[PDB]
Protein backbone atom coordinates (compact mmCIF):
# COMPACT_ATOMS: atom_id res chain seq x y z
CA UNK A 1 0.00 0.00 0.00
CA UNK A 2 2.71 2.87 0.85
CA UNK A 3 4.90 1.72 -2.30
CA UNK A 4 2.29 2.73 -4.68
CA UNK A 5 1.66 6.27 -2.58
CA UNK A 6 4.85 7.74 -3.53
CA UNK A 7 6.07 6.77 -7.26
CA UNK A 8 5.23 10.07 -8.90
CA UNK A 9 8.89 11.66 -9.46
CA UNK A 10 10.14 14.46 -12.16
CA UNK A 11 12.50 11.77 -13.73
CA UNK A 12 11.04 9.47 -16.01
CA UNK A 13 13.70 7.19 -15.25
CA UNK A 14 12.57 7.05 -11.67
CA UNK A 15 9.08 6.63 -12.47
CA UNK A 16 9.69 3.66 -14.74
CA UNK A 17 11.97 1.85 -12.02
CA UNK A 18 9.24 2.04 -9.46
CA UNK A 19 6.46 0.75 -12.31
CA UNK A 20 9.02 -2.03 -12.47
CA UNK A 21 9.43 -2.70 -8.88
CA UNK A 22 6.11 -2.79 -8.42
CA UNK A 23 5.04 -4.95 -11.21
CA UNK A 24 7.82 -7.73 -9.89
CA UNK A 25 6.06 -7.55 -6.14
CA UNK A 26 2.91 -7.94 -7.27
CA UNK A 27 3.77 -11.10 -9.68
CA UNK A 28 6.04 -12.81 -7.11
CA UNK A 29 3.91 -11.70 -4.30
CA UNK A 30 0.25 -12.67 -6.45
CA UNK A 31 -1.38 -14.90 -2.93
CA UNK A 32 -2.05 -13.46 0.60
CA UNK A 33 -1.91 -9.73 -1.14
CA UNK A 34 -4.82 -7.69 -0.65
CA UNK A 35 -5.13 -5.01 -4.26
CA UNK A 36 -5.72 -1.52 -2.81
CA UNK A 37 -8.46 -0.54 -5.12
CA UNK A 38 -9.40 3.01 -3.62
CA UNK A 39 -6.09 4.17 -4.44
CA UNK A 40 -5.78 3.57 -8.13
CA UNK A 41 -8.95 5.42 -8.32
CA UNK A 42 -7.80 8.63 -6.24
CA UNK A 43 -4.84 8.60 -8.47
CA UNK A 44 -7.00 8.66 -11.94
CA UNK A 45 -9.71 10.56 -10.49
CA UNK A 46 -8.33 13.79 -11.26
CA UNK A 47 -10.96 16.48 -12.72
CA UNK A 48 -8.50 19.49 -13.99
CA UNK A 49 -7.49 19.05 -17.88
CA UNK A 50 -3.78 19.05 -19.25
CA UNK A 51 -2.86 18.38 -15.97
CA UNK A 52 -0.75 14.62 -15.99
CA UNK A 53 -2.55 13.22 -12.40
CA UNK A 54 -4.60 10.31 -13.97
CA UNK A 55 -1.42 9.04 -16.05
CA UNK A 56 0.00 7.48 -13.14
CA UNK A 57 -3.58 5.47 -11.91
CA UNK A 58 -4.21 4.42 -15.29
CA UNK A 59 -0.45 3.29 -15.32
CA UNK A 60 -0.92 0.88 -11.95
CA UNK A 61 -4.04 -0.64 -12.84
CA UNK A 62 -2.41 -1.98 -16.38
CA UNK A 63 0.47 -3.42 -13.86
CA UNK A 64 -1.76 -4.64 -11.82
CA UNK A 65 -3.83 -5.75 -14.80
CA UNK A 66 -0.87 -7.77 -16.38
CA UNK A 67 -1.01 -10.56 -13.54
CA UNK A 68 -4.77 -12.16 -14.08
CA UNK A 69 -6.54 -9.90 -11.63
CA UNK A 70 -9.91 -8.64 -11.04
CA UNK A 71 -10.14 -5.37 -13.25
CA UNK A 72 -11.21 -3.26 -10.60
CA UNK A 73 -14.43 -2.64 -8.25
CA UNK A 74 -14.08 -6.30 -6.38
CA UNK A 75 -17.63 -5.71 -5.39
CA UNK A 76 -15.98 -5.41 -1.88
CA UNK A 77 -18.09 -2.71 -0.84
CA UNK A 78 -14.44 -0.68 -1.32
CA UNK A 79 -16.30 1.86 -3.64
CA UNK A 80 -19.44 1.70 -6.05
CA UNK A 81 -19.66 0.77 -10.17
CA UNK A 82 -20.31 4.40 -10.75
CA UNK A 83 -16.12 4.82 -10.10
CA UNK A 84 -15.74 2.35 -12.67
CA UNK A 85 -17.19 5.56 -15.10
CA UNK A 86 -14.09 7.79 -13.91
CA UNK A 87 -11.96 5.64 -15.30
CA UNK A 88 -13.37 5.78 -18.70
CA UNK A 89 -14.15 9.58 -18.69
CA UNK A 90 -10.13 9.79 -18.49
CA UNK A 91 -10.15 9.20 -22.19
CA UNK A 92 -12.04 12.67 -22.69
CA UNK A 93 -8.83 15.10 -21.13
CA UNK A 94 -6.89 16.01 -24.90
CA UNK A 95 -3.52 17.19 -24.72
CA UNK A 96 -0.51 16.23 -23.22
CA UNK A 97 -1.31 12.53 -24.08
CA UNK A 98 -0.33 9.68 -21.74
CA UNK A 99 -3.94 9.50 -20.40
CA UNK A 100 -6.49 8.72 -23.30
CA UNK A 101 -4.68 6.37 -25.37
CA UNK A 102 -3.18 4.56 -21.78
CA UNK A 103 -6.81 4.47 -20.47
CA UNK A 104 -8.21 3.57 -24.24
CA UNK A 105 -5.80 0.32 -24.04
CA UNK A 106 -6.15 -0.87 -20.58
CA UNK A 107 -10.33 0.04 -20.78
CA UNK A 108 -9.63 -2.47 -23.80
CA UNK A 109 -7.92 -5.17 -21.61
CA UNK A 110 -10.70 -4.88 -18.60
CA UNK A 111 -13.60 -5.18 -21.69
CA UNK A 112 -11.72 -8.44 -22.73
CA UNK A 113 -11.28 -9.90 -18.78
CA UNK A 114 -14.66 -9.19 -18.35
CA UNK A 115 -15.88 -10.68 -21.75
CA UNK A 116 -13.93 -13.92 -21.60
CA UNK A 117 -15.41 -14.62 -17.39
CA UNK A 118 -18.62 -13.62 -18.60
CA UNK A 119 -20.09 -11.60 -15.14
CA UNK A 120 -20.77 -7.97 -16.79
CA UNK A 121 -19.80 -8.13 -20.39
CA UNK A 122 -21.15 -4.52 -21.98
CA UNK A 123 -22.07 -2.42 -19.37
CA UNK A 124 -18.43 -1.01 -19.76
CA UNK A 125 -18.80 -0.59 -23.38
CA UNK A 126 -21.80 1.61 -23.50
CA UNK A 127 -20.04 4.30 -22.08
CA UNK A 128 -16.82 3.66 -23.91
CA UNK A 129 -18.33 3.41 -27.32
CA UNK A 130 -20.53 6.67 -26.09
CA UNK A 131 -17.23 8.48 -25.41
CA UNK A 132 -16.09 7.60 -28.65
CA UNK A 133 -19.16 8.58 -30.47
CA UNK A 134 -18.73 11.76 -28.55
CA UNK A 135 -14.95 12.43 -29.56
CA UNK A 136 -16.50 11.33 -33.25
CA UNK A 137 -18.50 14.30 -34.21
CA UNK A 138 -17.23 17.08 -32.10
CA UNK A 139 -14.62 17.52 -34.31
CA UNK A 140 -11.05 15.98 -33.05
CA UNK A 141 -11.09 12.86 -36.01
CA UNK A 142 -7.25 12.62 -35.45
CA UNK A 143 -8.01 11.18 -31.67
CA UNK A 144 -10.80 9.53 -32.10
CA UNK A 145 -9.34 6.86 -34.84
CA UNK A 146 -6.09 6.53 -32.65
CA UNK A 147 -8.67 5.98 -29.35
CA UNK A 148 -10.54 3.36 -31.10
CA UNK A 149 -7.38 1.46 -32.38
CA UNK A 150 -5.48 1.21 -29.07
CA UNK A 151 -9.20 -0.16 -27.80
CA UNK A 152 -9.16 -2.48 -30.78
CA UNK A 153 -5.18 -3.98 -30.31
CA UNK A 154 -7.53 -5.93 -27.07
CA UNK A 155 -11.50 -5.78 -28.04
CA UNK A 156 -11.81 -6.23 -31.83
CA UNK A 157 -15.61 -6.10 -31.37
CA UNK A 158 -16.25 -2.57 -30.42
CA UNK A 159 -14.84 -1.92 -34.38
CA UNK A 160 -18.45 -3.09 -35.47
CA UNK A 161 -20.33 0.26 -34.30
CA UNK A 162 -17.71 2.47 -36.18
CA UNK A 163 -16.55 0.44 -39.50
CA UNK A 164 -19.20 2.77 -41.49
CA UNK A 165 -17.25 5.94 -40.06
CA UNK A 166 -13.81 4.48 -40.27
CA UNK A 167 -14.59 3.86 -44.15
CA UNK A 168 -15.94 7.85 -44.17
CA UNK A 169 -12.83 8.61 -42.22
CA UNK A 170 -10.62 6.90 -44.50
CA UNK A 171 -9.81 9.21 -47.67
CA UNK A 172 -9.16 12.28 -45.40
CA UNK A 173 -6.97 10.79 -43.36
CA UNK A 174 -2.43 10.74 -44.25
CA UNK A 175 0.27 10.10 -42.65
CA UNK A 176 0.05 7.49 -39.83
CA UNK A 177 -3.74 8.11 -39.05
CA UNK A 178 -4.58 6.46 -42.68
CA UNK A 179 -2.28 3.49 -41.23
CA UNK A 180 -4.34 3.40 -38.17
CA UNK A 181 -7.57 3.28 -39.75
CA UNK A 182 -6.27 0.50 -41.87
CA UNK A 183 -5.51 -1.48 -39.15
CA UNK A 184 -8.48 -0.42 -37.30
CA UNK A 185 -10.55 -2.04 -40.58
CA UNK A 186 -7.76 -5.07 -40.41
CA UNK A 187 -9.02 -6.27 -36.81
CA UNK A 188 -12.35 -7.45 -38.15
CA UNK A 189 -12.59 -8.48 -41.89
CA UNK A 190 -14.24 -11.79 -41.45
CA UNK A 191 -18.08 -12.14 -41.85
CA UNK A 192 -17.65 -8.36 -42.80
CA UNK A 193 -19.76 -8.68 -46.79
CA UNK A 194 -19.54 -6.52 -49.49
CA UNK A 195 -15.93 -5.42 -47.83
CA UNK A 196 -14.09 -5.19 -51.50
CA UNK A 197 -17.08 -2.92 -52.48
CA UNK A 198 -15.88 -0.88 -49.56
CA UNK A 199 -12.53 -0.55 -50.12
CA UNK A 200 -12.18 -0.33 -53.83
CA UNK A 201 -15.09 2.80 -53.21
CA UNK A 202 -12.25 4.90 -51.44
CA UNK A 203 -9.62 4.12 -54.17
CA UNK A 204 -7.57 1.28 -52.16
CA UNK A 205 -4.75 0.80 -55.22
CA UNK A 206 -4.37 4.28 -54.64
CA UNK A 207 -3.42 3.27 -50.97
CA UNK A 208 -1.77 -0.08 -52.08
CA UNK A 209 0.83 1.66 -54.55
CA UNK A 210 2.46 4.21 -51.84
CA UNK A 211 5.58 3.53 -50.85
CA UNK A 212 5.21 3.19 -46.90
CA UNK A 213 6.68 -0.60 -45.96
CA UNK A 214 3.87 -0.81 -43.22
CA UNK A 215 0.84 0.33 -44.48
CA UNK A 216 1.50 -1.86 -47.52
CA UNK A 217 1.98 -4.51 -45.45
CA UNK A 218 -1.50 -3.97 -43.45
CA UNK A 219 -3.03 -3.58 -47.26
CA UNK A 220 -1.18 -7.04 -48.08
CA UNK A 221 -2.72 -8.88 -45.20
CA UNK A 222 -6.18 -6.74 -45.54
CA UNK A 223 -6.10 -8.61 -49.06
CA UNK A 224 -4.53 -12.17 -47.63
CA UNK A 225 -8.02 -12.14 -45.20
CA UNK A 226 -10.13 -10.86 -47.60
CA UNK A 227 -8.88 -13.29 -49.85
CA UNK A 228 -11.49 -16.38 -49.72
CA UNK A 229 -15.92 -15.54 -50.21
CA UNK A 230 -14.11 -13.38 -53.21
CA UNK A 231 -15.24 -13.97 -57.04
CA UNK A 232 -12.41 -14.74 -59.46
CA UNK A 233 -13.59 -11.47 -61.43
CA UNK A 234 -12.91 -8.94 -58.27
CA UNK A 235 -9.00 -10.88 -57.85
CA UNK A 236 -8.37 -10.57 -61.27
CA UNK A 237 -8.35 -6.32 -60.70
CA UNK A 238 -6.88 -7.09 -57.43
CA UNK A 239 -3.93 -9.33 -58.40
CA UNK A 240 -2.22 -6.53 -60.64
CA UNK A 241 -1.08 -4.18 -57.69
CA UNK A 242 -0.10 -7.55 -55.78
CA UNK A 243 2.06 -8.81 -58.11
CA UNK A 244 3.71 -5.39 -59.00
CA UNK A 245 5.20 -6.00 -55.40
CA UNK A 246 8.23 -7.76 -56.59
CA UNK A 247 11.67 -6.17 -56.30
CA UNK A 248 9.94 -4.49 -52.98
CA UNK A 249 12.75 -3.05 -50.92
CA UNK A 250 10.92 -4.76 -47.98
CA UNK A 251 11.29 -8.19 -47.39
CA UNK A 252 7.87 -8.92 -45.93
CA UNK A 253 5.72 -7.44 -48.15
CA UNK A 254 7.56 -9.83 -50.71
CA UNK A 255 6.34 -12.49 -47.92
CA UNK A 256 3.05 -11.59 -47.75
CA UNK A 257 2.58 -11.20 -51.40
CA UNK A 258 4.15 -14.79 -51.62
CA UNK A 259 1.44 -15.95 -49.31
CA UNK A 260 -1.15 -14.95 -51.00
CA UNK A 261 0.64 -16.48 -54.24
CA UNK A 262 0.47 -19.93 -52.63
CA UNK A 263 -3.04 -19.40 -51.68
CA UNK A 264 -4.05 -18.57 -55.67
CA UNK A 265 -2.42 -21.54 -57.15
CA UNK A 266 -3.67 -24.07 -54.85
CA UNK A 267 -7.40 -22.84 -54.97
CA UNK A 268 -7.39 -21.97 -58.77
CA UNK A 269 -5.46 -25.24 -60.29
CA UNK A 270 -6.96 -26.98 -62.77
CA UNK A 271 -10.67 -24.98 -62.64
CA UNK A 272 -13.59 -27.09 -63.45
CA UNK A 273 -13.61 -26.02 -67.46
CA UNK A 274 -13.44 -22.94 -69.00
CA UNK A 275 -15.57 -21.40 -66.37
CA UNK A 276 -13.68 -18.01 -66.37
CA UNK A 277 -11.01 -17.17 -68.40
CA UNK A 278 -10.24 -14.48 -65.34
CA UNK A 279 -9.56 -18.02 -63.21
CA UNK A 280 -7.51 -19.05 -66.29
CA UNK A 281 -5.49 -15.37 -66.57
CA UNK A 282 -5.05 -15.04 -62.56
CA UNK A 283 -3.26 -18.72 -62.26
CA UNK A 284 -1.24 -17.66 -64.76
CA UNK A 285 -0.02 -14.34 -63.52
CA UNK A 286 0.21 -16.35 -60.44
CA UNK A 287 2.26 -19.36 -61.67
CA UNK A 288 4.27 -17.08 -63.64
CA UNK A 289 5.28 -14.88 -60.59
CA UNK A 290 5.53 -17.61 -58.32
CA UNK A 291 8.65 -19.26 -60.76
CA UNK A 292 10.48 -15.86 -60.51
CA UNK A 293 9.86 -15.96 -56.94
CA UNK A 294 12.44 -18.69 -57.46
CA UNK A 295 15.41 -16.14 -57.63
CA UNK A 296 14.36 -13.78 -54.64
CA UNK A 297 17.26 -12.33 -53.16
CA UNK A 298 16.07 -13.15 -49.59
CA UNK A 299 17.47 -16.74 -49.25
CA UNK A 300 14.71 -17.37 -46.67
CA UNK A 301 11.41 -16.45 -48.44
CA UNK A 302 13.72 -18.18 -51.79
Not at 52 to 77: F, H
Not at 219 to 240: A, H, S, T
Not at 268 to 280: C, H, I, L, V, W
Request: charged share 25%; aromatic share 10%; glycine share 2%.
Amino acid sequence: NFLMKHVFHPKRAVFRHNLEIIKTLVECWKDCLSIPYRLIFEKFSGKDPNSKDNSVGIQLLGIVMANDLPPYDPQCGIQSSEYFQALVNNMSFVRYKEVYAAAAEVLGLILRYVMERKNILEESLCELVAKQLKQHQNTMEDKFIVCLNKVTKSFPPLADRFMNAVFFLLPKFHGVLKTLCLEVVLCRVEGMTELYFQLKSKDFVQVMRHRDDERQKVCLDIIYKMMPKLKPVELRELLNPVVEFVSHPSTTCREQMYNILMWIHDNYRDPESETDNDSQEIFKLAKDVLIQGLIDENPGLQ
